[PDB]
Coordinates of N, CA and C and ligand atoms in Angstrom, one line a residue:
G1 N 18.0 -51.7 65.6 CA 17.3 -50.9 66.6 C 18.2 -50.1 67.5
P2 N 17.6 -49.3 68.4 CA 18.4 -48.6 69.4 C 19.1 -49.5 70.3
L3 N 20.2 -49.1 70.9 CA 20.8 -49.8 72.0 C 19.8 -50.2 73.1
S4 N 20.0 -51.4 73.6 CA 19.2 -51.8 74.8 C 20.0 -51.7 76.1
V5 N 21.3 -51.3 76.0 CA 22.1 -51.0 77.1 C 22.7 -49.7 76.8
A6 N 22.3 -48.7 77.6 CA 22.6 -47.3 77.2 C 24.1 -47.0 77.3
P7 N 24.5 -46.0 76.5 CA 25.9 -45.5 76.7 C 26.2 -45.2 78.1
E8 N 27.4 -45.4 78.5 CA 27.8 -45.1 79.9 C 27.7 -43.7 80.3
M9 N 27.5 -43.5 81.6 CA 27.5 -42.1 82.2 C 28.1 -42.2 83.5
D10 N 28.5 -41.1 84.1 CA 29.1 -41.1 85.4 C 28.1 -41.5 86.5
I11 N 28.5 -42.4 87.4 CA 27.6 -43.0 88.3 C 27.0 -42.1 89.3
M12 N 27.7 -41.1 89.8 CA 27.2 -40.2 90.7 C 26.3 -39.1 90.0
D13 N 26.6 -38.8 88.7 CA 25.7 -38.0 87.9 C 24.3 -38.7 87.8
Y14 N 24.4 -40.0 87.5 CA 23.2 -40.8 87.4 C 22.4 -40.8 88.7
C15 N 23.1 -41.0 89.8 CA 22.4 -41.0 91.1 C 21.7 -39.6 91.4
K16 N 22.4 -38.6 91.1 CA 21.9 -37.2 91.3 C 20.7 -36.9 90.5
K17 N 20.6 -37.4 89.3 CA 19.4 -37.3 88.4 C 18.2 -38.0 89.0
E18 N 18.5 -39.3 89.4 CA 17.4 -40.2 89.8 C 16.9 -40.0 91.2
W19 N 17.7 -39.6 92.2 CA 17.4 -39.6 93.5 C 17.5 -38.2 94.1
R20 N 16.4 -37.5 94.0 CA 16.4 -36.1 94.5 C 15.5 -36.1 95.7
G21 N 15.6 -35.0 96.5 CA 14.8 -34.9 97.7 C 15.4 -35.6 99.0
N22 N 14.6 -35.6 100.1 CA 15.2 -35.8 101.4 C 14.7 -37.1 102.1
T23 N 14.0 -38.0 101.3 CA 13.5 -39.2 102.0 C 14.6 -40.1 102.5
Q24 N 14.3 -41.0 103.4 CA 15.2 -42.0 103.8 C 15.6 -42.9 102.7
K25 N 14.7 -43.3 101.8 CA 15.0 -44.1 100.7 C 16.0 -43.4 99.8
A26 N 15.8 -42.2 99.5 CA 16.8 -41.5 98.6 C 18.2 -41.4 99.2
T27 N 18.2 -41.2 100.5 CA 19.5 -41.2 101.2 C 20.2 -42.6 101.1
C28 N 19.4 -43.6 101.3 CA 20.0 -45.0 101.2 C 20.5 -45.2 99.8
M29 N 19.8 -44.8 98.8 CA 20.2 -45.0 97.5 C 21.5 -44.3 97.2
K30 N 21.6 -43.0 97.6 CA 22.8 -42.3 97.5 C 24.0 -43.0 98.1
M31 N 23.8 -43.5 99.4 CA 24.9 -44.2 100.0 C 25.3 -45.4 99.2
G32 N 24.3 -46.1 98.7 CA 24.6 -47.2 97.9 C 25.4 -46.9 96.6
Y33 N 25.0 -45.9 95.9 CA 25.8 -45.5 94.7 C 27.2 -45.0 95.1
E34 N 27.3 -44.3 96.2 CA 28.6 -43.9 96.7 C 29.5 -45.1 96.9
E35 N 29.0 -46.2 97.5 CA 29.7 -47.4 97.7 C 30.1 -48.0 96.4
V36 N 29.2 -48.1 95.4 CA 29.6 -48.6 94.1 C 30.7 -47.8 93.5
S37 N 30.6 -46.5 93.6 CA 31.6 -45.6 93.0 C 33.0 -45.7 93.5
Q38 N 33.2 -46.4 94.7 CA 34.5 -46.7 95.1 C 35.3 -47.6 94.2
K39 N 34.6 -48.4 93.4 CA 35.2 -49.3 92.5 C 34.9 -49.1 91.0
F40 N 33.8 -48.5 90.7 CA 33.4 -48.2 89.4 C 33.1 -46.7 89.2
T41 N 33.4 -46.2 88.0 CA 33.2 -44.8 87.8 C 31.9 -44.5 87.0
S42 N 31.4 -45.5 86.3 CA 30.3 -45.3 85.3 C 29.2 -46.3 85.4
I43 N 28.1 -46.1 84.8 CA 27.0 -47.0 84.8 C 26.4 -47.0 83.4
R44 N 26.0 -48.2 83.0 CA 25.2 -48.4 81.8 C 23.8 -48.8 82.2
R45 N 22.8 -48.0 81.8 CA 21.4 -48.3 82.1 C 20.8 -49.4 81.1
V46 N 20.4 -50.5 81.7 CA 19.9 -51.7 81.0 C 18.4 -51.5 80.8
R47 N 17.9 -51.8 79.6 CA 16.5 -51.7 79.3 C 15.7 -52.4 80.3
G48 N 14.7 -51.8 80.9 CA 13.8 -52.2 82.0 C 12.6 -53.0 81.6
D49 N 12.8 -53.9 80.6 CA 11.8 -54.9 80.3 C 11.9 -56.1 81.1
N50 N 11.1 -57.2 80.8 CA 11.1 -58.4 81.6 C 12.3 -59.3 81.4
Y51 N 13.3 -58.9 80.5 CA 14.5 -59.5 80.3 C 15.7 -58.9 81.0
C52 N 15.4 -57.8 81.8 CA 16.5 -57.0 82.3 C 17.6 -57.8 83.0
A53 N 17.3 -58.8 83.8 CA 18.3 -59.5 84.5 C 19.2 -60.3 83.6
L54 N 18.6 -60.9 82.6 CA 19.4 -61.6 81.5 C 20.2 -60.7 80.7
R55 N 19.6 -59.5 80.3 CA 20.3 -58.6 79.5 C 21.6 -58.1 80.2
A56 N 21.4 -57.7 81.5 CA 22.5 -57.1 82.3 C 23.6 -58.1 82.4
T57 N 23.2 -59.4 82.8 CA 24.2 -60.4 83.1 C 24.9 -60.8 81.8
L58 N 24.2 -61.0 80.7 CA 24.8 -61.4 79.4 C 25.7 -60.3 78.8
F59 N 25.2 -59.1 78.9 CA 25.9 -58.0 78.3 C 27.3 -57.9 79.0
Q60 N 27.2 -58.0 80.4 CA 28.5 -58.0 81.1 C 29.5 -59.1 80.8
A61 N 28.9 -60.3 80.8 CA 29.6 -61.5 80.6 C 30.3 -61.5 79.2
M62 N 29.5 -61.1 78.2 CA 30.0 -61.1 76.8 C 31.0 -59.9 76.5
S63 N 30.7 -58.8 77.1 CA 31.6 -57.7 76.9 C 33.0 -57.9 77.6
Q64 N 33.0 -58.8 78.6 CA 34.3 -59.1 79.2 C 34.9 -60.3 78.7
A65 N 34.4 -61.0 77.7 CA 34.8 -62.3 77.3 C 36.2 -62.2 76.6
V66 N 37.2 -62.9 77.2 CA 38.5 -63.0 76.6 C 38.8 -64.5 76.2
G67 N 37.8 -65.3 76.4 CA 37.9 -66.7 76.0 C 36.5 -67.3 75.9
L68 N 36.4 -68.4 75.3 CA 35.2 -69.2 75.1 C 35.2 -70.2 76.2
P69 N 34.2 -70.1 77.1 CA 34.2 -71.1 78.2 C 34.0 -72.5 77.8
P70 N 34.6 -73.5 78.6 CA 34.4 -74.9 78.3 C 33.0 -75.3 78.0
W71 N 32.1 -74.8 78.8 CA 30.7 -75.3 78.6 C 30.1 -74.9 77.2
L72 N 30.7 -73.8 76.6 CA 30.3 -73.4 75.3 C 31.1 -74.0 74.2
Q73 N 32.3 -74.6 74.5 CA 33.1 -75.4 73.6 C 32.5 -76.8 73.4
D74 N 31.8 -77.3 74.4 CA 31.4 -78.7 74.5 C 30.4 -79.0 73.3
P75 N 30.7 -79.9 72.4 CA 29.8 -80.3 71.4 C 28.4 -80.7 71.8
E76 N 28.4 -81.3 73.1 CA 27.1 -81.7 73.6 C 26.1 -80.6 73.7
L77 N 26.6 -79.4 73.8 CA 25.6 -78.3 74.0 C 24.7 -78.2 72.8
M78 N 25.2 -78.4 71.6 CA 24.3 -78.3 70.4 C 23.3 -79.4 70.3
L79 N 23.6 -80.6 71.0 CA 22.8 -81.8 70.9 C 21.7 -81.8 72.0
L80 N 21.9 -80.9 73.0 CA 21.0 -80.8 74.1 C 19.5 -80.6 73.8
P81 N 19.2 -79.7 72.9 CA 17.7 -79.4 72.6 C 17.0 -80.7 72.2
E82 N 17.6 -81.4 71.2 CA 17.0 -82.6 70.7 C 16.8 -83.7 71.8
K83 N 17.9 -83.8 72.6 CA 17.8 -84.9 73.7 C 16.8 -84.5 74.8
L84 N 16.8 -83.3 75.2 CA 15.9 -82.9 76.3 C 14.5 -82.9 75.8
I85 N 14.2 -82.4 74.7 CA 12.8 -82.3 74.2 C 12.3 -83.6 73.9
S86 N 13.1 -84.5 73.3 CA 12.7 -85.8 73.0 C 12.4 -86.6 74.2
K87 N 13.1 -86.4 75.3 CA 12.9 -87.1 76.5 C 11.7 -86.5 77.4
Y88 N 11.6 -85.2 77.4 CA 10.7 -84.5 78.2 C 9.7 -83.7 77.3
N89 N 8.6 -84.4 76.9 CA 7.8 -83.8 75.8 C 7.1 -82.5 76.3
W90 N 7.0 -82.4 77.6 CA 6.3 -81.2 78.2 C 7.1 -79.9 78.0
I91 N 8.4 -80.1 77.5 CA 9.2 -78.9 77.2 C 8.5 -78.2 75.9
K92 N 7.7 -78.9 75.1 CA 7.0 -78.3 74.0 C 6.0 -77.3 74.4
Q93 N 5.8 -77.1 75.8 CA 4.9 -76.1 76.3 C 5.7 -74.7 76.3
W94 N 7.0 -74.8 75.9 CA 7.8 -73.6 75.8 C 7.1 -72.4 75.0
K95 N 7.1 -71.2 75.6 CA 6.5 -70.0 75.0 C 7.7 -69.3 74.4
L96 N 7.7 -69.1 73.1 CA 8.8 -68.4 72.4 C 8.7 -66.9 72.6
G97 N 9.8 -66.2 72.5 CA 9.9 -64.8 72.6 C 10.3 -64.1 71.3
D98 N 10.5 -76.6 64.0 CA 10.0 -76.9 65.3 C 10.8 -76.2 66.5
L99 N 10.4 -76.5 67.7 CA 11.1 -76.0 68.8 C 12.6 -76.4 68.9
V100 N 12.9 -77.7 68.7 CA 14.2 -78.1 68.7 C 15.1 -77.2 67.7
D101 N 14.6 -77.0 66.5 CA 15.4 -76.2 65.6 C 15.6 -74.8 66.1
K102 N 14.6 -74.2 66.7 CA 14.6 -72.8 67.2 C 15.7 -72.6 68.3
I103 N 15.6 -73.6 69.3 CA 16.5 -73.5 70.4 C 17.9 -73.8 69.9
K104 N 18.1 -74.8 69.1 CA 19.4 -75.1 68.5 C 20.0 -73.9 67.8
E105 N 19.2 -73.2 67.0 CA 19.6 -71.9 66.4 C 20.1 -70.9 67.4
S106 N 19.3 -70.7 68.5 CA 19.7 -69.8 69.5 C 21.0 -70.1 70.2
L107 N 21.2 -71.4 70.5 CA 22.4 -71.8 71.2 C 23.6 -71.7 70.2
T108 N 23.4 -72.0 69.0 CA 24.4 -71.8 68.0 C 24.8 -70.3 67.9
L109 N 23.9 -69.5 67.9 CA 24.1 -68.0 67.8 C 24.9 -67.6 69.1
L110 N 24.5 -68.0 70.3 CA 25.2 -67.6 71.5 C 26.7 -68.0 71.4
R111 N 26.9 -69.3 71.0 CA 28.2 -69.8 70.9 C 29.1 -69.0 69.9
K112 N 28.5 -68.7 68.7 CA 29.2 -68.0 67.6 C 29.6 -66.6 68.0
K113 N 28.6 -65.9 68.6 CA 28.8 -64.5 69.1 C 29.9 -64.5 70.2
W114 N 29.8 -65.4 71.1 CA 30.7 -65.4 72.3 C 32.1 -65.7 71.8
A115 N 32.2 -66.7 70.8 CA 33.5 -67.0 70.3 C 34.1 -65.9 69.5
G116 N 33.3 -65.1 68.8 CA 33.8 -64.0 68.0 C 34.3 -62.9 68.9
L117 N 33.6 -62.6 70.0 CA 34.0 -61.6 71.0 C 35.3 -62.0 71.6
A118 N 35.5 -63.3 72.0 CA 36.7 -63.8 72.6 C 37.9 -63.6 71.7
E119 N 37.7 -63.7 70.4 CA 38.8 -63.7 69.4 C 39.4 -62.3 69.2
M120 N 38.6 -61.3 69.6 CA 38.9 -59.9 69.3 C 40.2 -59.4 70.0
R121 N 41.0 -58.6 69.3 CA 42.3 -58.3 69.8 C 42.3 -57.0 70.7
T122 N 41.3 -56.2 70.5 CA 41.2 -55.0 71.3 C 39.9 -55.0 72.1
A123 N 40.0 -54.5 73.4 CA 38.8 -54.5 74.2 C 37.7 -53.5 73.6
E124 N 38.2 -52.4 72.9 CA 37.3 -51.5 72.3 C 36.6 -52.2 71.2
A125 N 37.2 -53.1 70.4 CA 36.6 -53.8 69.3 C 35.5 -54.7 69.9
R126 N 35.8 -55.3 71.0 CA 34.8 -56.1 71.7 C 33.6 -55.3 72.2
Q127 N 33.9 -54.1 72.7 CA 32.7 -53.3 73.2 C 31.9 -52.8 72.0
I128 N 32.5 -52.5 70.9 CA 31.8 -52.1 69.7 C 30.9 -53.2 69.2
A129 N 31.4 -54.4 69.2 CA 30.7 -55.6 68.7 C 29.5 -55.9 69.7
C130 N 29.9 -55.9 70.9 CA 28.9 -56.3 71.9 C 27.8 -55.3 71.9
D131 N 28.1 -53.9 71.8 CA 27.0 -52.9 71.7 C 26.1 -53.3 70.5
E132 N 26.7 -53.6 69.3 CA 25.8 -53.9 68.1 C 24.9 -55.1 68.3
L133 N 25.3 -56.1 69.1 CA 24.5 -57.2 69.4 C 23.3 -56.9 70.2
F134 N 23.4 -55.9 71.1 CA 22.3 -55.5 72.0 C 21.6 -54.2 71.5
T135 N 21.0 -54.4 70.3 CA 20.3 -53.3 69.6 C 18.9 -53.7 69.4
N136 N 18.3 -54.5 70.3 CA 16.8 -54.7 70.3 C 16.3 -55.5 69.1
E137 N 17.2 -56.2 68.4 CA 16.8 -56.9 67.2 C 16.6 -58.4 67.6
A138 N 16.2 -59.2 66.6 CA 16.0 -60.6 66.8 C 17.1 -61.3 67.5
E139 N 18.4 -61.0 67.0 CA 19.5 -61.7 67.6 C 19.6 -61.5 69.1
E140 N 19.4 -60.3 69.6 CA 19.4 -60.1 71.1 C 18.5 -61.0 71.8
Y141 N 17.2 -61.1 71.3 CA 16.2 -61.9 72.0 C 16.4 -63.4 71.8
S142 N 17.0 -63.8 70.7 CA 17.5 -65.2 70.5 C 18.5 -65.6 71.6
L143 N 19.4 -64.7 72.0 CA 20.3 -65.0 73.1 C 19.6 -65.4 74.4
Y144 N 18.5 -64.6 74.7 CA 17.7 -64.9 75.9 C 17.0 -66.2 75.8
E145 N 16.6 -66.6 74.7 CA 15.9 -67.9 74.6 C 17.0 -69.0 74.9
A146 N 18.2 -68.9 74.4 CA 19.3 -69.8 74.7 C 19.5 -69.9 76.2
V147 N 19.7 -68.7 76.8 CA 20.0 -68.7 78.2 C 18.8 -69.3 79.1
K148 N 17.6 -68.9 78.7 CA 16.5 -69.5 79.4 C 16.5 -71.1 79.3
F149 N 16.8 -71.6 78.1 CA 16.9 -73.0 77.9 C 18.0 -73.6 78.8
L150 N 19.1 -72.9 78.9 CA 20.2 -73.4 79.7 C 19.8 -73.4 81.2
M151 N 19.0 -72.4 81.6 CA 18.4 -72.4 82.9 C 17.5 -73.7 83.2
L152 N 16.7 -74.0 82.2 CA 15.8 -75.1 82.3 C 16.6 -76.4 82.4
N153 N 17.6 -76.5 81.6 CA 18.4 -77.7 81.6 C 19.1 -77.9 82.9
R154 N 19.7 -76.8 83.5 CA 20.3 -76.9 84.8 C 19.3 -77.3 85.9
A155 N 18.1 -76.7 85.8 CA 17.1 -77.1 86.8 C 16.7 -78.5 86.7
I156 N 16.6 -79.1 85.5 CA 16.3 -80.5 85.3 C 17.4 -81.3 85.9
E157 N 18.6 -80.9 85.7 CA 19.7 -81.7 86.2 C 19.7 -81.7 87.8
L158 N 19.5 -80.5 88.3 CA 19.4 -80.4 89.8 C 18.3 -81.2 90.4
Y159 N 17.1 -81.1 89.7 CA 16.0 -81.9 90.2 C 16.3 -83.4 90.2
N160 N 16.8 -83.8 89.0 CA 17.1 -85.2 88.9 C 18.2 -85.7 89.9
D161 N 19.1 -84.8 90.2 CA 20.1 -85.1 91.2 C 19.5 -85.3 92.5
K162 N 18.6 -84.4 92.9 CA 17.9 -84.5 94.2 C 17.1 -85.8 94.3
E163 N 16.4 -86.1 93.2 CA 15.7 -87.4 93.1 C 16.6 -88.6 93.4
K164 N 17.8 -88.6 92.9 CA 18.7 -89.7 93.1 C 19.4 -89.6 94.5
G165 N 19.0 -88.7 95.3 CA 19.6 -88.5 96.6 C 21.0 -87.9 96.6
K166 N 21.4 -87.3 95.5 CA 22.8 -86.7 95.3 C 22.8 -85.3 96.0
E167 N 24.0 -84.9 96.4 CA 24.2 -83.5 96.9 C 23.8 -82.5 95.8
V168 N 23.0 -81.5 96.2 CA 22.7 -80.4 95.4 C 23.0 -79.1 96.2
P169 N 23.1 -78.0 95.5 CA 23.2 -76.7 96.3 C 21.9 -76.3 96.8
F170 N 21.9 -75.7 98.0 CA 20.7 -75.4 98.7 C 19.7 -74.5 98.0
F171 N 20.2 -73.6 97.1 CA 19.3 -72.7 96.4 C 18.3 -73.6 95.6
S172 N 18.7 -74.7 95.2 CA 17.8 -75.6 94.4 C 16.7 -76.1 95.2
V173 N 17.0 -76.4 96.5 CA 15.9 -76.8 97.4 C 14.9 -75.6 97.5
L174 N 15.4 -74.4 97.6 CA 14.5 -73.3 97.7 C 13.7 -73.0 96.4
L175 N 14.4 -73.3 95.3 CA 13.8 -73.1 94.0 C 12.6 -74.0 93.9
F176 N 12.7 -75.3 94.2 CA 11.7 -76.2 94.0 C 10.7 -76.3 95.2
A177 N 11.0 -75.6 96.3 CA 10.1 -75.4 97.4 C 8.9 -74.5 97.1
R178 N 9.1 -73.6 96.2 CA 8.0 -72.7 95.9 C 6.8 -73.5 95.3
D179 N 5.6 -73.2 95.8 CA 4.5 -74.0 95.5 C 4.1 -73.9 94.0
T180 N 4.6 -72.9 93.3 CA 4.4 -72.8 91.8 C 5.6 -73.3 91.0
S181 N 6.5 -74.0 91.7 CA 7.7 -74.4 91.0 C 8.2 -75.7 91.6
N182 N 7.3 -76.7 91.9 CA 7.8 -77.9 92.7 C 8.6 -78.8 91.8
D183 N 8.5 -78.7 90.5 CA 9.3 -79.6 89.6 C 9.6 -78.8 88.3
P184 N 10.4 -79.4 87.4 CA 10.9 -78.6 86.3 C 9.8 -78.1 85.3
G185 N 8.7 -78.9 85.2 CA 7.6 -78.5 84.3 C 6.9 -77.3 84.9
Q186 N 6.7 -77.3 86.2 CA 6.1 -76.2 86.9 C 7.0 -74.9 86.8
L187 N 8.3 -75.1 86.9 CA 9.2 -74.0 86.7 C 9.1 -73.5 85.3
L188 N 9.0 -74.3 84.3 CA 8.8 -73.8 82.9 C 7.5 -73.1 82.7
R189 N 6.4 -73.7 83.1 CA 5.0 -73.1 82.8 C 4.8 -71.9 83.6
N190 N 5.3 -71.8 84.9 CA 4.8 -70.8 85.8 C 5.9 -69.7 86.0
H191 N 7.1 -70.0 85.6 CA 8.2 -69.0 85.8 C 9.0 -68.7 84.5
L192 N 9.6 -69.7 83.9 CA 10.5 -69.4 82.8 C 9.7 -68.9 81.6
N193 N 8.5 -69.5 81.3 CA 7.7 -69.0 80.2 C 7.2 -67.5 80.4
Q194 N 7.2 -67.1 81.6 CA 6.8 -65.7 81.9 C 8.0 -64.7 81.7
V195 N 9.2 -65.2 81.8 CA 10.4 -64.4 81.8 C 10.6 -63.8 80.4
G196 N 10.7 -62.5 80.4 CA 10.7 -61.7 79.1 C 9.3 -61.3 78.7
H197 N 8.3 -61.8 79.3 CA 6.9 -61.6 78.9 C 6.1 -60.8 79.9
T198 N 5.9 -61.4 81.1 CA 5.1 -60.8 82.1 C 5.9 -60.6 83.4
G199 N 7.1 -61.2 83.5 CA 7.8 -61.0 84.7 C 9.3 -61.2 84.5
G200 N 10.1 -60.8 85.5 CA 11.6 -61.0 85.4 C 12.0 -62.1 86.4
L201 N 13.3 -62.4 86.5 CA 13.8 -63.4 87.5 C 13.7 -63.0 88.9
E202 N 13.3 -64.0 89.7 CA 13.2 -63.9 91.2 C 14.6 -64.2 91.7
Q203 N 14.9 -63.9 93.0 CA 16.2 -64.2 93.6 C 16.7 -65.6 93.4
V204 N 15.8 -66.5 93.7 CA 16.3 -67.9 93.6 C 16.7 -68.2 92.2
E205 N 16.1 -67.6 91.2 CA 16.4 -67.7 89.8 C 17.7 -67.1 89.4
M206 N 18.2 -66.1 90.2 CA 19.5 -65.5 89.9 C 20.6 -66.5 90.2
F207 N 20.4 -67.4 91.2 CA 21.3 -68.5 91.4 C 21.3 -69.5 90.2
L208 N 20.1 -69.7 89.7 CA 19.9 -70.6 88.6 C 20.6 -70.1 87.3
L209 N 20.4 -68.8 87.1 CA 21.1 -68.1 86.0 C 22.6 -68.2 86.1
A210 N 23.2 -67.9 87.3 CA 24.6 -68.0 87.5 C 25.1 -69.4 87.2
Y211 N 24.4 -70.4 87.6 CA 24.8 -71.8 87.4 C 24.7 -72.1 85.9
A212 N 23.6 -71.6 85.2 CA 23.4 -71.9 83.8 C 24.5 -71.4 82.9
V213 N 25.1 -70.2 83.2 CA 26.1 -69.6 82.4 C 27.5 -69.7 83.0
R214 N 27.6 -70.3 84.2 CA 28.8 -70.5 84.9 C 29.6 -69.2 85.0
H215 N 28.8 -68.2 85.6 CA 29.4 -66.9 85.9 C 29.0 -66.6 87.4
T216 N 29.9 -66.1 88.1 CA 29.6 -65.6 89.5 C 29.0 -64.2 89.3
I217 N 27.9 -64.0 89.9 CA 27.2 -62.7 89.7 C 27.2 -62.0 91.1
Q218 N 28.0 -60.9 91.1 CA 28.1 -60.0 92.3 C 27.2 -58.8 92.2
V219 N 26.2 -58.8 93.1 CA 25.2 -57.7 92.9 C 25.2 -56.8 94.2
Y220 N 25.3 -55.5 93.9 CA 25.1 -54.4 94.9 C 23.6 -54.3 95.0
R221 N 23.0 -54.6 96.1 CA 21.6 -54.6 96.3 C 21.3 -53.4 97.2
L222 N 21.0 -52.3 96.5 CA 20.9 -51.0 97.3 C 19.8 -50.9 98.3
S223 N 18.7 -51.7 98.1 CA 17.6 -51.7 99.1 C 18.0 -52.5 100.3
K224 N 19.2 -53.1 100.3 CA 19.7 -53.9 101.4 C 21.0 -53.2 102.0
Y225 N 21.2 -51.9 101.7 CA 22.4 -51.2 102.0 C 22.9 -51.4 103.4
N226 N 22.0 -51.2 104.4 CA 22.4 -51.2 105.8 C 22.3 -52.6 106.4
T227 N 22.6 -53.6 105.6 CA 22.6 -55.0 106.0 C 23.7 -55.8 105.3
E228 N 23.9 -57.0 105.8 CA 25.0 -57.8 105.2 C 24.7 -58.2 103.8
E229 N 23.4 -58.0 103.3 CA 23.1 -58.3 101.9 C 23.4 -57.2 100.9
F230 N 24.1 -56.1 101.4 CA 24.4 -55.0 100.6 C 25.0 -55.4 99.3
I231 N 25.8 -56.4 99.4 CA 26.2 -57.2 98.3 C 25.8 -58.6 98.5
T232 N 25.2 -59.3 97.5 CA 25.0 -60.7 97.4 C 25.7 -61.3 96.2
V233 N 26.3 -62.4 96.4 CA 27.0 -63.1 95.3 C 26.3 -64.4 95.0
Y234 N 26.0 -64.6 93.7 CA 25.3 -65.8 93.2 C 26.3 -66.6 92.3
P235 N 26.6 -67.9 92.7 CA 26.3 -68.5 93.9 C 27.2 -68.1 95.0
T236 N 27.0 -68.5 96.2 CA 27.9 -68.1 97.3 C 29.3 -68.6 97.2
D237 N 29.4 -69.9 96.7 CA 30.7 -70.6 96.7 C 30.9 -71.2 95.3
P238 N 31.1 -70.4 94.3 CA 31.3 -70.9 92.9 C 32.7 -71.5 92.8
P239 N 32.9 -72.2 91.7 CA 34.3 -72.5 91.3 C 35.1 -71.2 91.1
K240 N 36.4 -71.3 91.6 CA 37.3 -70.1 91.5 C 37.4 -69.7 90.1
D241 N 37.2 -70.6 89.1 CA 37.5 -70.2 87.7 C 36.3 -69.7 87.0
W242 N 35.1 -69.5 87.6 CA 34.0 -68.9 86.9 C 34.3 -67.4 86.9
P243 N 34.2 -66.7 85.7 CA 34.3 -65.3 85.7 C 33.3 -64.6 86.5
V244 N 33.6 -63.4 87.0 CA 32.7 -62.6 87.8 C 32.1 -61.4 87.0
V245 N 30.8 -61.3 87.1 CA 30.1 -60.1 86.6 C 29.5 -59.3 87.7
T246 N 29.6 -58.0 87.7 CA 29.0 -57.2 88.7 C 27.8 -56.4 88.2
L247 N 26.8 -56.4 89.0 CA 25.5 -55.7 88.7 C 25.1 -54.8 89.8
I248 N 24.2 -53.9 89.6 CA 23.5 -53.1 90.6 C 22.0 -53.3 90.5
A249 N 21.4 -53.6 91.7 CA 20.0 -53.7 91.8 C 19.4 -52.8 92.8
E250 N 18.7 -51.7 92.4 CA 18.1 -50.8 93.4 C 17.1 -51.5 94.3
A251 N 16.3 -52.4 93.7 CA 15.1 -53.0 94.5 C 14.9 -54.5 94.1
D252 N 16.0 -55.2 93.9 CA 15.9 -56.6 93.5 C 15.0 -57.0 92.3
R253 N 14.7 -56.0 91.4 CA 13.9 -56.2 90.3 C 14.7 -56.0 89.0
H254 N 15.2 -54.7 88.9 CA 15.8 -54.2 87.8 C 17.3 -54.1 88.1
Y255 N 18.1 -54.5 87.1 CA 19.5 -54.5 87.2 C 20.1 -53.6 86.2
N256 N 21.1 -52.7 86.6 CA 22.0 -51.9 85.8 C 23.4 -52.4 85.9
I257 N 24.3 -51.9 85.1 CA 25.7 -52.4 84.9 C 26.7 -51.3 85.3
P258 N 27.5 -51.5 86.4 CA 28.6 -50.6 86.7 C 29.8 -51.0 85.8
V259 N 30.4 -49.9 85.3 CA 31.6 -50.1 84.4 C 32.8 -49.2 84.9
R260 N 33.9 -49.7 84.5 CA 35.2 -48.9 84.6 C 36.1 -49.4 83.4
Ligands
CA1 CA1 33.5 -46.4 73.5
CL2 CL1 20.4 -32.9 85.3

């Protein structure tokens, strides 16, 4: 299919096309892109479907991959679908975009693709491969199923930790505080099953995504330009060794990718 992450273009050309006229909002958006442009020259427009946060994050992460992270090296990753689903039968309420075989296939694909990108000797080779992966075919959407599953797993771990009275990050308190997400099954039925289908990730879920793929997500939040949230980093205090991916969000809904 066609690319789902558009070829790059100059960031201020993009801004000039999108934000015309004299409103306060347009001016704030221009200021926001000007700030991004201090560090990045170009932007790739990410398909604005209900997977956009996952597509933006994963595209960035994979296109920058120079190694296979330990969490993807771990043999336990491939065993996780069987163990989780066997233990928590309610995971069978998973809405696809048996179940154990499907999720395992998706995780295997994620690992295989990531490992192949990491092996590549030129960054251009990596960009070519990574473009081909994000062409709106079954493989792309399989990656999202894997990432969603990792999000569920991390949420289960955090919930169980909280139950045992163990220290957890505060975002997880906020995640489970939502009346539609009080436990992992509610998270699955009311939030994760909707992702890619009827809605995208909420703020608190961007922290969950970051934890699930062990990447630090630095977001220019243009609707927050004249405030301290003009950039928000997910999580706030990650391990120093998590790679960093940078995104742009005009309105905390849709994410695009700055490049240099
Ligand atoms: Ca190129
Ligand atoms: Cl034009």
